[model samples]
Target: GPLGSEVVRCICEVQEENDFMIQCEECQSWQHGVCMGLLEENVPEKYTCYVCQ
Candidate 1:
């Protein structure tokens, strides 16, 4: 549990941020939506990030 943030969530691109967190449906990895798209600030039924789609 301690290493939760250390998962793929810490992708090389936009590492740390407070903008908004978005999870890719493909790999289930967390990322910044606006920093990168609406899935972050306010997600939808089946939102997918760039990496996912």
Candidate 2:
């Protein structure tokens, strides 16, 4: 069996809401609900980042 490189998945939470920007854990990348096609009032339950899914 071959073990491939490790992949990490991060669960982001909506800490604060201002204008149309969301501050994640690191705040390195800002997610715009409107940009993601998400409603302003709608909140994402979870975001999963899988290598091959």
Candidate 3:
């Protein structure tokens, strides 16, 4: 299968927030923790976004 060429955005916000961002290991795009449904204590050691799965 061909990898998607389109740029991936956060699932929660229209604009990217650099204050607190988490990068998906598979795609390398950054997403805000709050936008990605994560909290400081809930963030995992590894994360894979919906698109990457």
Candidate 4:
């Protein structure tokens, strides 16, 4: 699970905004902004990384 490049790509693809939204460097999904499930508006700028999970 050391590789995250693939996931990063996936997130970027679905990212809503270019500047405001940052793709998860882990799961390839959009960062857990206040919109997702993140507790705060300062969720780490990273990917989810779970492709088949």
Candidate 5:
């Protein structure tokens, strides 16, 4: 598919909030909550990563 261009996702194996994550509001991809400089427990309902903008 066109979406499978190259790399896999993740900033690292995990962070302090390893089990936490959020869905990209634009692309629908999942990313670690802390990876986007957001609090693991306080991510917004809508999160648009840099790739989508």
Candidate 6:
């Protein structure tokens, strides 16, 4: 018998007080601004995740 587990994780975290999130243009992954160590106001118009780069 063979058993396996598949897990998917987001690269970012979020806070209830700051629910702002952004999507990476290349990976299409959604990440919270706070998790990415960025602010919503400073997020660029075109963004790519670290993996994507």
What count of clashes does model 5 give? 0
> What's the candidate order when arranged by decreasing TM-score?
3, 6, 5, 1, 2, 4
Model 5 CA lDDT for position 39: 88
On residues 1-53, what C-alpha lDDT tens digit does candidate 3 reach at each position? 13754343577645546666777888877677777778868878798775675
lDDT per residue for candidate 1 within 12-48, as digits (tens), equals: 4756766567666666776666554454336874766
* Best-matching candidate per TM-score: 3
Per-candidate TM-scores read 0.54, 0.32, 0.63, 0.26, 0.57, 0.60
Clashes of 3: 0
How much is 7 displaced in model 6, in angstroms?
13
**Model 6 — which ten-residue stretch has the worst lDDT?**
1-10
**How many steric clashes does model 4 contain?**
10
Q: Which candidate number would show the highest lDDT if scored against the true structure?
A: 3
The total number of steric clashes, by the backbone 3 Å criterion, in model 1 comes to 1
Give the Å error, residue 19, model 3: 3.0
Show model 3 residue runs off by greater than 4 Å.
1-8
lDDT of 4 at 11: 27
Compared with the true structure, what per-residue lDDT tens digits does model 4 show for residues 14-43?
534433444555444444243344454555
Cα-based RMSD of the predictions, in order? 4.2, 10.7, 3.9, 6.1, 4.4, 6.6
lDDT of 5 by residue, 1-53 (tens): 15683222445644234566676777665667667778866777777765674
- Model 2 stretches with alpha carbons more than 4 Å out: 1-18, 23-28, 47-53
Give candidate 6's TM-score. Answer: 0.60
Tell me the whole-model lDDT of each prediction, alpha carbons only: 0.58, 0.40, 0.69, 0.42, 0.61, 0.58
